[PDB]
Symmetry: C2
Subunit: 187 residues, 2 copies
């Protein structure tokens, strides 16, 4: 129940064979460097690489389209060391559903814009900014509710899967464009 | 039984309700005026699928997952015809990508596709099968249409509400799919 933070976001994962829903804290830190590279903690190289490729394109896109403010620092990601850590690893098969969160955290750190902490999110993204479908949306929604999040963001593509429930604000999104105003503190 | 360039996708419309089986047909012909002709498939999905098919067709053959094509395998030098029995919603459209890609590869390499399954799922350039929405509604549609089996993204197995009368086959990659859907015999 805190105030916005830069580079910190809450994802939603389904763990173990039983597919148990749980919240996962994601923290991304970025620093200019002559020895560029990534340092991953509890996030596979594949998920990380893809998330970076996406954040690289989408960060430039939304800024150029004036949907996100110009960063104070250099928006290029190839000239820095990126630190990504997950409080716990996602399962191999559910891992891609953390991409939206990782991208938002990278974008948040890259543009030094505080990210709201009153929501959790699940979903992937494509180079166009479309929010992609994920699996286990109900288990993830329940986990968000358990930690007391006021809102949970999911792919519009998964609304059909949602088992009518209350106790939390379920917000479907179809594009990174719709997400921005929901997760960023532009004040 | 097997047909070249024909496959069955699964769509969900409106707020909810059982899905619809969507017959997808792809035809490819060499032409000095290459381009695409679309029917009930958006330009975005068609474009993405063609790019995916161009890359994955070459990848599968180069990785011995499909036989060496006897004909020209270039998509840039031909007219591609893709038609859906019905349009998908904008938000569910991506879930037809695997199917379209498979149908394109089928027509391009002239390898018939088995006609005893329905499929749902997207794909990335690496060949990973991506999650989709409304899997339960889609599996239902498949069953009611009479399909013996339905292929879905492994990422969605957790969403599957127990059901009977149909073989549910979760897959994580295009590689796993190929032997299950192509008629190589």
């Amino acid at each position: 129940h805190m105030e916005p933070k830069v580079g910190v976001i809450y994802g939603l994962a389904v763990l173990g064979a039983g597919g148990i829903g749980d919240v996962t804290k994601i923290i991304v830190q970025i620093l200019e460097s002559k020895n560029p590279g990534t340092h991953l903690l509890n996030i596979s190289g594949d998920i990380a690489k893809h998330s970076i490729t996406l954040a690289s394109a989408l960060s430039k896109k939304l800024v150029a389209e004036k949907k996100l403010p110009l960063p104070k620092k250099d928006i290029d990601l190839n000239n820095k060391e990126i630190y990504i850590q997950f409080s716990q690893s996602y399962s191999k098969i559910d891992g891609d559903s953390a991409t939206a969160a990782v991208c938002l955290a990278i974008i948040s750190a890259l543009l030094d814009i505080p990210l709201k902490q009153d929501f959790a999110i699940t979903g992937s993204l494509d180079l166009s900014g479309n929010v992609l479908a994920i699996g286990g949306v109900n288990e993830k929604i329940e986990a968000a509710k358990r930690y007391g999040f006021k809102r949970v963001i999911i792919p519009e593509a998964n609304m059909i899967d949602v088992i009518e429930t209350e106790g939390i604000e379920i917000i479907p999104v179809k594009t990174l464009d719709e997400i921005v105003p929901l997760v960023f503190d532009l004040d």
